Amino acid sequence: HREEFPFYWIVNVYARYTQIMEITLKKAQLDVSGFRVLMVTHQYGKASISQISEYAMAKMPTVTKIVGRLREDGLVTTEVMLTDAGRQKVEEAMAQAGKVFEKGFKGMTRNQVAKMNLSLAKVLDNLN
Amino acid sequence: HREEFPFYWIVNVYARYTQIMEITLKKAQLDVSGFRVLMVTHQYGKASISQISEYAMAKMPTVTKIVGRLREDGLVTTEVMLTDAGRQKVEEAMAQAGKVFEKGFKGMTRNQVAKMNLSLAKVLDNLN
Ligand SMILES: O=C(O)Cc1c[nH]c2ccccc12
Ligand SMILES: O=C(O)Cc1c[nH]c2ccccc12
């Protein structure tokens, strides 16, 4: 097979990555959406559905059904919402994901990884 | 929001890309799976489900249900399968996708795009 397809590796890294994070986070009782929604709220501290909905990679009616599973499970509480022993869920989650990122970027320099992410961010400006 | 997440841009380029290709290929009567299954067969000329199933980003029972929609629509025929006026479907498809790739990589050098895809292929070796 040929890369006559400039997005071949975006897609393949994305699929192998999603696959690994599905089974890793099932250790920590989470799916990827659940894990993204917690992390957006974590950086914001207290977040709106509109704001989560920007970054979690989901239209607001998924986020609202996601945030409501996480309300009911004592990981988020509080319009605006905030983390609880979610703060412990995100330690658990990022410990697992840190193993995934460590394996992922092994043998790659800091500058390689930065130039890759700079180039990818130019692809996104262009698609937007 | 912070990239304390080295895959933030893989995922965002992947989501904006999938979004654009969904609506572009609906011009040409195709979804992305249909478009990938045709292209794998095209490079192979005549391909098995096992072989398509490697590259199309789908487990074999999707590919087998995908190849059967494309059998029934005169885009693939022939164990092994091959393109027809599929050969015309792939001109139509890659014309559209070439507009997507042209916009995508605008203002980026050939070497930038190659180094990005080399780095991404190291991420995949590592995840595999
Ligand atoms: O979707 C893309 O452009 C990348 C890609 C991954 N697998 C493919 C198989 C056939 C055609 C393109 C792709
Ligand atoms: O899935 C990833 O690792 C990337 C990513 C995209 N949006 C996110 C929101 C919160 C946490 C991580 C991500």
Residue numbers in the entry:
A (entry chain A), B (entry chain A): 18 to 95, 106 to 155
Please quote the paper that reports this structure.
Most characterized MarR-family regulators function as repressors by binding to an operator sequence upstream of the genes they control. When a relevant ligand binds the MarR repressor, it releases from DNA, allowing gene expression. The structures of MarRs from representatives of each auxin degradation operon type establish that each has distinct IAA-binding pockets.
MarR proteins were produced from three iad and three iac loci and their binding affinities for IAA were measured. Crystal structures for the IAA-binding IacR MarRs from P. putida, E. soli and A. baumannii and IadR MarR from B. japonicum were determined and refined to 1.5–2.8 Å resolution.
